[PDB]
Amino acid sequence: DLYSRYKKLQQELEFLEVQEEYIKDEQKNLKK
Amino acid sequence: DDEFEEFPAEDWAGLDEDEDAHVWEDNWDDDNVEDDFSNQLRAELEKHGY
Amino acid sequence: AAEHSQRELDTVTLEDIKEHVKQLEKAVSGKEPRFVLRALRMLPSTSRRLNHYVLYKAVQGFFTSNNATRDFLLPFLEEPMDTFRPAASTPLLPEVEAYLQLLVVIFMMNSKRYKEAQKISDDLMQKISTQNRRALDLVAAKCYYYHARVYEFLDKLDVVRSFLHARLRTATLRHDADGQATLLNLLLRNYLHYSLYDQAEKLVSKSVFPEQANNNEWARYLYYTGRIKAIQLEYSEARRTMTNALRKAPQHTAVGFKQTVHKLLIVVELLLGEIPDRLQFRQPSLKRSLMPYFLLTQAVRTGNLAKFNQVLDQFGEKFQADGTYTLIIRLRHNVIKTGVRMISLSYSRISLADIAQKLQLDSPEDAEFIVAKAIRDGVIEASINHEKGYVQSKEMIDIYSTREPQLAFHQRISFCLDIHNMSVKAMRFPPK
Amino acid sequence: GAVLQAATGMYEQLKGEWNRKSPNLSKCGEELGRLKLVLLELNFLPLTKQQLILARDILEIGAQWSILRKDIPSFERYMAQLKCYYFDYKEQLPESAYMHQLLGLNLLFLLSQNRVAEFHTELERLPAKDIQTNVYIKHPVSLEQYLMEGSYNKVFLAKGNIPAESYTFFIDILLDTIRDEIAGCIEKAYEKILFTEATRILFFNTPKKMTDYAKKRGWVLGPNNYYTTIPSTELAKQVIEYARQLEMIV
Amino acid sequence: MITSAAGIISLLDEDEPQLKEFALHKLNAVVNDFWAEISESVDKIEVLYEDEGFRSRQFAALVASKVFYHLGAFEESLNYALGAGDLFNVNDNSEYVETIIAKCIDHYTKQCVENADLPEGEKKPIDQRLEGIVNKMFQRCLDDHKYKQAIGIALETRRLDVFEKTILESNDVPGMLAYSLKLCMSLMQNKQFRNKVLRVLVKIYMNLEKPDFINVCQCLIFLDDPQAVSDILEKLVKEDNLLMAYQICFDLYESASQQFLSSVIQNLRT
Amino acid sequence: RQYYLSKIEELQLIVNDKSQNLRRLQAQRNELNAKVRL
């Protein structure tokens, strides 16, 4: 319940970070 | 926005009469004391000749 | 006739407050901060009306879950005898109940009734001490501010210090900004109100203000720290901060705020030697209010001890009324440094006998001591040649080819780059 | 109760020996030591009005004894505790006749170690009706106004205008404070200063004293008795930072 | 009523220890009112703490702990809060107590994972006080009967002993076993700790009075332990529960790898 | 117990901030990719 929600929150933040770095790299390559 | 009611929102008394209510905006050197111009020159110049 | 207009205004205020409440619910919907400052931004304008019929209708419409918290306002509330839920028994959002209790408090406040407002504000904070939701943090900031407004006219600010300290620490732990800013400003006012300037200064040094805090709270904090360092003798940073705050001060409202800030910036400036601009002594909203301080500045610029003494004897009540009587003591004792300041700005070199003649110092050694004290501070840049008697100022080297423009430009361009970066981060595209 | 009445008589004896022309410092010292030790048991700081009168008088006699004993590090602590005991939130004890005396003493002490900001705060603390009226603080305010205006010679004239004998103790050390401040002012005001005029304005009547105070600093006598680049790194870091803020997306 | 801490910090400079005890009691009474004045005078508190001859160095440690808790130097606040000892009433609901408890949990989890990944020869020792106080969180959670939260904290802290105890003493053994299995499969990533946790649930499953051999076999397939499942199948064969054996083997065929099935067959053959 | 809720709300605010930022970055990449495709 509480702990599972905490784990899902941390996992979603991690996935958000992956998407963030991917989008930055793709932005650089698209600018080129 | 906060009106800063912590500060008493100072009422300007009873919105009484101002000094002149002019559009004549002045500077800090317009409130000094001077004594005309001709007298300045002469009274300062008889010590040397006029 | 009057009842018809009153009923129409009650209905339009009911719809506006309904918009506020719906705005709280669609702000708690979407799980996001903001859109609640869109709720609280115009509580002054709606609190302008605050009639009894509209408040009672709102209470009966949005507190359909009749609780003891609704049954505590009802005794003091005067409900209309003859007199809307936008509809099931879904439990009330705590943000909604806090906001509704807030408007109830403010109506009960503007009617010059304080003690019951004191109790009701206390019960508002006793329940807000139980919630741990960021949606009830921006609301809670304004609840705290209006609560301290309730308490201020009841002359019981000292008892609130413990609560404000605890909630400020709670905000700092939760990284709150609006609540933190409101509590910090309010507690600085608490410390200065009981003349705990040392305590306020010490608190300031170990407390970092959030950069994201709203403009008005930032201006309040800047004013408070500026007063602290002005009575703490940090005049240069003082004037810098009050100039910043006046740039952040509202143009239309906060007449009392701008008046106090203008008064303290005037005294800080002429303590540092700077002469306040005459135009700020000309706007109608400030003219007669600064008229005591305007005569103060006239005496300061003239520098005659006779008119100075008469101005002091005539306006000392105004001087202490702002907590500036000691400030004006230092003012009366720094007018001489001010005089030396224009003397040295006008003259590249000047004999100390000439200094005593133009300043009425009656002694070359007295002039030497006074000018040495003045030049100790960063008021006058010179190079005293006691071999001959020169007060030869430093060569005004070209500001260009001196790296000073490079540093100033670096700071400014960094400011523009941060502005651009924050703007591009604040694009905030919507989902649909 | 019983300990409180015993301490009442005990500090009656304390002040009785103390107000005697020159109290035997050891007796009253051990007395007030054990007296504060038991005052910890008599509810030191927050209450019977006589209890706070007792504790406030303990600290007042202790502070004036520090004047008499001539110890500053303890003097500051007696100052702070009895400041928590003089005039802040107390309001139940009768106005001590010895309030303003030590407000002035503490202000002068604070000036003695270059604490003008803190001193000004303490000036703000006390009421406005007394700065220009109460002589126990008119002597501080007059002297410090003369200090701030730079009229040091006015201080040299008024050093004897103290309102009570319990001022000269740090009137002397204020006299040394002003002279060291003045010496710093001359050092950062002049380029070269002659031996004779330096001896004249350093307020060291003994020329030997002036020479010792000159050796104490690096400001030296002089032969005839008469005392940038392009860093290209931080600015380069700045331009690289600008390029960084242009690049690397938002 | 008090107005500042100047009197108290001035009392702090005094020499006799008992007056220091009284002043420390007053500081602990009011450090949430005016922290700033003692914040600049915390060096006295540190030199008070580091003295061995003090009879109450723990109280100085606690005072400095609260001071640093205000200061935001939560690292030194945690240091001198662990230095407080038993006077840190865990059962207290103080905000300082609560936040230092949370930071104790965070530091313990960080230390636990950084010691778990590292080999045995390089394990930095965990402080005894933080281990005991976090054990007091598990005990307090069990007394409050928030068993899921204790399970989660144990998984965060790599404490298989606390996890095993929490599952054993939990009121609902099968439901908590299922919740732990779902969490372990769907949410945790570290493979070696995953194997250790799966072995823990396997042991609890087999020691359970009516072993949920479907879940045990699933965990064994996830663990790749053909010998254990072969022995369990032999146990089922000798125990006559043939329906268990049939459903288990069908599950292994549907789920386990070809190598796993071939190895199990070879073990069943021998 | 309350520690769990505090961590959850902190992670929730961080996640909201990062999701809003990711939406902004996705929009920027969308317009730039549209320009490249055109």
PDB file of N, CA, C and O in Angstrom, chain E residues 207-230:
ATOM      1  N   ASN E 207       8.498 -24.250   5.444  1.00  0.00           N
ATOM      2  CA  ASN E 207       8.245 -24.373   6.874  1.00  0.00           C
ATOM      3  C   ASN E 207       6.790 -24.101   7.236  1.00  0.00           C
ATOM      4  O   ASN E 207       6.399 -24.350   8.381  1.00  0.00           O
ATOM      5  N   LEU E 208       5.990 -23.600   6.300  1.00  0.00           N
ATOM      6  CA  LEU E 208       4.582 -23.354   6.566  1.00  0.00           C
ATOM      7  C   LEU E 208       3.838 -24.684   6.658  1.00  0.00           C
ATOM      8  O   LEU E 208       4.213 -25.674   6.025  1.00  0.00           O
ATOM      9  N   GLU E 209       2.774 -24.701   7.468  1.00  0.00           N
ATOM     10  CA  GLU E 209       2.154 -25.963   7.871  1.00  0.00           C
ATOM     11  C   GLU E 209       1.578 -26.716   6.675  1.00  0.00           C
ATOM     12  O   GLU E 209       1.628 -27.951   6.621  1.00  0.00           O
ATOM     13  N   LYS E 210       1.023 -25.992   5.707  1.00  0.00           N
ATOM     14  CA  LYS E 210       0.476 -26.587   4.493  1.00  0.00           C
ATOM     15  C   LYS E 210       1.140 -25.916   3.302  1.00  0.00           C
ATOM     16  O   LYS E 210       0.567 -24.981   2.721  1.00  0.00           O
ATOM     17  N   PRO E 211       2.336 -26.352   2.903  1.00  0.00           N
ATOM     18  CA  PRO E 211       3.147 -25.555   1.974  1.00  0.00           C
ATOM     19  C   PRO E 211       2.415 -25.243   0.677  1.00  0.00           C
ATOM     20  O   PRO E 211       1.872 -26.129   0.015  1.00  0.00           O
ATOM     21  N   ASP E 212       2.410 -23.957   0.325  1.00  0.00           N
ATOM     22  CA  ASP E 212       1.809 -23.485  -0.922  1.00  0.00           C
ATOM     23  C   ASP E 212       2.760 -23.809  -2.074  1.00  0.00           C
ATOM     24  O   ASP E 212       3.378 -22.937  -2.689  1.00  0.00           O
ATOM     25  N   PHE E 213       2.848 -25.109  -2.369  1.00  0.00           N
ATOM     26  CA  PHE E 213       3.923 -25.611  -3.220  1.00  0.00           C
ATOM     27  C   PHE E 213       3.859 -25.040  -4.629  1.00  0.00           C
ATOM     28  O   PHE E 213       4.856 -25.085  -5.355  1.00  0.00           O
ATOM     29  N   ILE E 214       2.713 -24.493  -5.036  1.00  0.00           N
ATOM     30  CA  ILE E 214       2.669 -23.757  -6.295  1.00  0.00           C
ATOM     31  C   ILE E 214       3.585 -22.544  -6.221  1.00  0.00           C
ATOM     32  O   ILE E 214       4.442 -22.331  -7.090  1.00  0.00           O
ATOM     33  N   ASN E 215       3.438 -21.746  -5.163  1.00  0.00           N
ATOM     34  CA  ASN E 215       4.296 -20.581  -4.994  1.00  0.00           C
ATOM     35  C   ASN E 215       5.741 -20.981  -4.734  1.00  0.00           C
ATOM     36  O   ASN E 215       6.661 -20.314  -5.219  1.00  0.00           O
ATOM     37  N   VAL E 216       5.963 -22.059  -3.978  1.00  0.00           N
ATOM     38  CA  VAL E 216       7.328 -22.512  -3.721  1.00  0.00           C
ATOM     39  C   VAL E 216       8.004 -22.914  -5.023  1.00  0.00           C
ATOM     40  O   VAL E 216       9.168 -22.582  -5.268  1.00  0.00           O
ATOM     41  N   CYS E 217       7.282 -23.639  -5.879  1.00  0.00           N
ATOM     42  CA  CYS E 217       7.856 -24.062  -7.149  1.00  0.00           C
ATOM     43  C   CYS E 217       8.081 -22.878  -8.077  1.00  0.00           C
ATOM     44  O   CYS E 217       9.075 -22.841  -8.809  1.00  0.00           O
ATOM     45  N   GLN E 218       7.173 -21.898  -8.064  1.00  0.00           N
ATOM     46  CA  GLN E 218       7.391 -20.692  -8.856  1.00  0.00           C
ATOM     47  C   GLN E 218       8.653 -19.968  -8.404  1.00  0.00           C
ATOM     48  O   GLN E 218       9.486 -19.565  -9.228  1.00  0.00           O
ATOM     49  N   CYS E 219       8.823 -19.818  -7.091  1.00  0.00           N
ATOM     50  CA  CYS E 219      10.008 -19.148  -6.573  1.00  0.00           C
ATOM     51  C   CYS E 219      11.270 -19.945  -6.873  1.00  0.00           C
ATOM     52  O   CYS E 219      12.330 -19.365  -7.118  1.00  0.00           O
ATOM     53  N   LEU E 220      11.178 -21.278  -6.858  1.00  0.00           N
ATOM     54  CA  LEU E 220      12.341 -22.100  -7.183  1.00  0.00           C
ATOM     55  C   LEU E 220      12.723 -21.971  -8.650  1.00  0.00           C
ATOM     56  O   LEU E 220      13.911 -21.886  -8.981  1.00  0.00           O
ATOM     57  N   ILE E 221      11.732 -21.970  -9.543  1.00  0.00           N
ATOM     58  CA  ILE E 221      12.011 -21.759 -10.959  1.00  0.00           C
ATOM     59  C   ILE E 221      12.660 -20.400 -11.162  1.00  0.00           C
ATOM     60  O   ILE E 221      13.622 -20.257 -11.925  1.00  0.00           O
ATOM     61  N   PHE E 222      12.147 -19.381 -10.471  1.00  0.00           N
ATOM     62  CA  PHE E 222      12.756 -18.060 -10.531  1.00  0.00           C
ATOM     63  C   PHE E 222      14.177 -18.080  -9.975  1.00  0.00           C
ATOM     64  O   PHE E 222      15.034 -17.302 -10.409  1.00  0.00           O
ATOM     65  N   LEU E 223      14.444 -18.959  -9.010  1.00  0.00           N
ATOM     66  CA  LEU E 223      15.766 -19.074  -8.407  1.00  0.00           C
ATOM     67  C   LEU E 223      16.702 -19.985  -9.185  1.00  0.00           C
ATOM     68  O   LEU E 223      17.913 -19.951  -8.937  1.00  0.00           O
ATOM     69  N   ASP E 224      16.177 -20.791 -10.105  1.00  0.00           N
ATOM     70  CA  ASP E 224      16.960 -21.798 -10.817  1.00  0.00           C
ATOM     71  C   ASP E 224      17.661 -22.730  -9.826  1.00  0.00           C
ATOM     72  O   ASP E 224      18.888 -22.767  -9.716  1.00  0.00           O
ATOM     73  N   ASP E 225      16.847 -23.474  -9.082  1.00  0.00           N
ATOM     74  CA  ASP E 225      17.325 -24.453  -8.106  1.00  0.00           C
ATOM     75  C   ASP E 225      16.686 -25.798  -8.424  1.00  0.00           C
ATOM     76  O   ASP E 225      15.748 -26.237  -7.748  1.00  0.00           O
ATOM     77  N   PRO E 226      17.170 -26.475  -9.467  1.00  0.00           N
ATOM     78  CA  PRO E 226      16.569 -27.761  -9.847  1.00  0.00           C
ATOM     79  C   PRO E 226      16.651 -28.823  -8.769  1.00  0.00           C
ATOM     80  O   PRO E 226      15.744 -29.658  -8.664  1.00  0.00           O
ATOM     81  N   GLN E 227      17.720 -28.832  -7.971  1.00  0.00           N
ATOM     82  CA  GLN E 227      17.858 -29.873  -6.959  1.00  0.00           C
ATOM     83  C   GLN E 227      16.769 -29.755  -5.900  1.00  0.00           C
ATOM     84  O   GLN E 227      16.172 -30.760  -5.496  1.00  0.00           O
ATOM     85  N   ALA E 228      16.488 -28.530  -5.452  1.00  0.00           N
ATOM     86  CA  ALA E 228      15.469 -28.333  -4.428  1.00  0.00           C
ATOM     87  C   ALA E 228      14.091 -28.752  -4.923  1.00  0.00           C
ATOM     88  O   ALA E 228      13.344 -29.426  -4.204  1.00  0.00           O
ATOM     89  N   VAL E 229      13.734 -28.369  -6.151  1.00  0.00           N
ATOM     90  CA  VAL E 229      12.417 -28.726  -6.669  1.00  0.00           C
ATOM     91  C   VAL E 229      12.338 -30.226  -6.929  1.00  0.00           C
ATOM     92  O   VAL E 229      11.277 -30.839  -6.775  1.00  0.00           O
ATOM     93  N   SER E 230      13.455 -30.845  -7.316  1.00  0.00           N
ATOM     94  CA  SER E 230      13.458 -32.297  -7.474  1.00  0.00           C
ATOM     95  C   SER E 230      13.209 -32.995  -6.141  1.00  0.00           C
ATOM     96  O   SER E 230      12.405 -33.933  -6.061  1.00  0.00           O
TER      97      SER E 230
END
